[PDB]
Each structure stands twice: as C-alpha cells, then as structure tokens.
Amino acid sequence: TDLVLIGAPHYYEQTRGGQVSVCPLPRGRARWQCDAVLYGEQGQPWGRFGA
C-alpha cells in the first residue's frame, strides 16, 4: 500500500463543499503527513464530496 485517502464530506467553503486528503504512508518512525487535497467542482455547496 502506498497511500490512504481520507474524506471530509462536510468541509465548508463559500463555493465548495467536501474535501478529500491524500496521505502517503509514513516511512519507519517518521510522522504521518498530508501532501495533496482533492476538490469537487465550483459552485456546489453542501455537495458532500468525499462521502
């Protein structure tokens, strides 16, 4: 396994709703961090992207 996708369907922005985070797996004892965030289309509040 390379990465874990984590969804936040109720993230609030004035024009977008929903957020998914890309998390590569930690190496050894290193800390776990997020690197990229995926988003839905614009103008779709409360779209629950990432449910």
Binding site: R27, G28, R29, A30
Partner: protein, 372 residues
C-alpha cells in the same frame, strides 16, 4: 538464590537442553580460621569442586587429582558445560607445618603438580564447553610463574562447540562438524590461523589481556601468645600485558574470530570462516566455503571451488575476490534496520559486475561500496 536466573539465561541463549555448570568453592575464611584456633589446619583442603545438572535452575565423573572431567551424554542431547566459579588448578594439594624458629609454625602450602593440564571428555552429544573462568597461570607467594595450565578437550561424535580463552587449547573435535569461537577476544586482540593440512595452528596476540591466576594468600591469627600462621590458594584477576599463545585445533571446520583484526585461513575442506567486528582477512582455500566478513573493512579471498559470501548492507567498504569456479554473493540474509529505512527508504543496492562495484548506500555516501 539469584544464580537460578543466570543459569536459565545461559540455557536459553545457547539453545541448550541442560547446563552442567562445574562450580569451585574455596574454603571459607571462617573454616580456615577455626582450623587455626584448633591447631589442626594441616589435613584440611582449601578448594573443593562440585558438579550438578541444572535444568532451568534446578537439579559427569571428575578427578581433581588427575585433571579429568568425564561427562556422559546421549545422541540428540544438546547440553552445555560451564564454569560458574573459576576452576582451580589440577593436581593434589598437600600441606605441612614447619617450626620456623621464633615465629611459631607458619609455612603451610604446596602443590604436587605432577600434571599441568585439565582434560575434558564430553562423550556423545552436541556439547558446548565454555572455557572462560578457567585458571591459566599458577604462581607461588613470590609471584613467579611455575606452569601454564593448559586445557585439552575431546569431542566424541556430534557437532561440538567450544568457546576459547587465553589458555593454550588443544581441541580434538572428533567426528561431526565442530566449531571453535574466539568471540571473547577484545578489539585490541587478534588471531592468526594457519593450516598444516588437517591441523590448525592458532597464534593469539592478546594486548593487556585479563587472566585468572592462582597464588597463595596468607591469613594469620594470634591466640594470646606467639603467632601461628596458615596459607591457602586464592584465585584472582590481573592484567598481564602482552601474551602470545599457540593453540592447536584438530577436526575443526568452523572458526569465529574476535572483535579485533583477525587473519583466518582454511583448508581443502568446506569451512565456515567468520571474522566478526574488525578489519579481518578471511581466506577459504580450496573447496566450497562460506565466508562472512562481518563489520569493518574486510578483505576476503575465496580460492577455488564454489564459495558463498554473506553481506549485511553495512556502512564500511569491503574487498571480495571469488577465485575460480562459480561463486555467489548474497545480500538477502539480513533484515534491513530501522535507520536504513529512515535514511534510504525502500532503495537497496546498485550492483554492476562489469564495473565490479556494489553500492549499498547509493547517492547518500559514495564510499560504502563492496568491490568484487
């Protein structure tokens, strides 16, 4: 009783079915004192030796007067023979009493010393003999070296392992694949093993070695008037500077060096040559040999035959020569460590036999390269 824990630890570490554990008990100062008060200190004996079996901390024919440890063992058994307390010298102890003039009847100790050897026969099993905690020098009250007590051991039938020491060792492995381990030697020490056919001559150079030696203590008692004195043997530790000893090995196929810079050479049979830590030189000679350089900057010569090299993704650089025949170098024996994964990730090695180099830490240091 805390000795049960250490006997159990030794039994677990060696994968031993049971541990024998010769123990040596010097006469208590109370007993010798009482022998002085009574006046009959003559016929007493100062050192007594007991032997038991110990499985996980609970419970062999020996003659102290002749230097022979005779233990019986059965095939498939995998026991261990250790010395819990320093083993005394061979031979029989004798005592007398001399008038010594105004001083009242002082001088007492002497040892016959017809033999200067301890002989250990193990029988028929996969026996482990731990030759540490054995006296290697005997001296008088004047501090002069009389004899170098030497150890002779016989192996029998199965795979036998002996862990060496500073004493002059004549190890007869008998049948089976046998091993001698010099892993107790420090970093400042070294061995140089040379082959004389089927026999091995081992020259050990120990710098500031620490060795048990047996002398003669002296306890004295006044009893309201002119003094009567006694003496007794006394094992002790001391560092004797530079020591050179020449061991002899027969029917031994595997040798492990110490923590120093060793030079180990094999013969025409199949050998397991391990160097351990330090900048060791290993040469296998003829036959199909297995060669483990260990840590340090090792130079390894395989010779003829099909040889096996075992590596460990270390930080040092090694020099490896295969010789004639089809040879193999293997890097998969060891599991990668945590810091290796942290610093390098999932990258292993870059090997190229045209260039003749194997890079164990590519793009992180350029000098961790094995030349083959």
């Amino acid at each position: 009783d805390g000795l049960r824990k250490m006997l159990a630890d030794l039994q677990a570490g060696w994968n031993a079915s049971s541990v024998i554990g010769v123990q040596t008990t010097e006469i208590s100062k109370s007993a010798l004192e009482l022998a002085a008060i009574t006046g009959n200190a003559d016929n007493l004996k100062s050192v007594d030796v007991f032997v038991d079996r110990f499985v996980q901390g609970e419970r062999v024919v020996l003659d102290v007067a002749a230097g022979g440890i005779d233990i019986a063992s059965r095939k498939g058994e995998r026991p261990a023979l250790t010395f819990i307390t320093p083993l005394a010298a061979p031979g029989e102890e004798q005592r007398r009493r001399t008038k010594t003039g105004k001083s009242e009847f002082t001088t007492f100790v002497e040892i016959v010393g017809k033999q200067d050897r301890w002989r250990i026969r193990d029988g028929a099993a996969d026996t482990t003999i731990d030759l540490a905690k054995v006296v290697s020098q005997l001296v008088d009250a004047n501090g002069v070296l009389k004899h170098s007590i030497k150890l002779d051991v016989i192996g029998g039938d199965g795979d036998d392992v002996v862990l060496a020491n500073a004493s002059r060792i004549h190890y007869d492995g008998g049948a089976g694949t046998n091993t001698v381990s010099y892993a107790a030697l420090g970093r400042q020490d070294s061995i140089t093993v040379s082959a004389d056919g089927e026999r091995f001559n081992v020259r050990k150079q120990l710098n500031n070695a620490n060795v048990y030696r047996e002398g003669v203590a002296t306890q004295t008692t006044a009893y309201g008037k002119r003094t009567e004195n006694v003496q007794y043997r006394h094992v002790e530790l001391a560092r004797v500077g530079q020591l050179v000893e020449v061991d002899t090995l027969e029917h031994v196929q595997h040798i492990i060096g110490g923590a120093g810079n060793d030079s180990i050479t094999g013969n025409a049979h199949d050998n397991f040559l391990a160097g351990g830590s330090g900048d060791d030189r290993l040469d296998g000679g003829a036959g199909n040999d297995t060669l483990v350089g260990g840590e340090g900057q090792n130079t390894v010569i395989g010779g003829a035959g099909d040889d096996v090299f075992l590596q460990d993704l270390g930080v040092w650089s090694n020099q490896l020569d295969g010789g004639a025949g089809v040879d193999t170098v293997k890097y998969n024996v060891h599991q990668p460590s945590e810091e290796r994964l942290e610093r390098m990730g999932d990258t292993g090695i870059h090997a190229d036999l045209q260039k003749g180099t194997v890079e164990k830490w590519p793009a992180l240091n350029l000098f961790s390269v094995d030349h083959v």
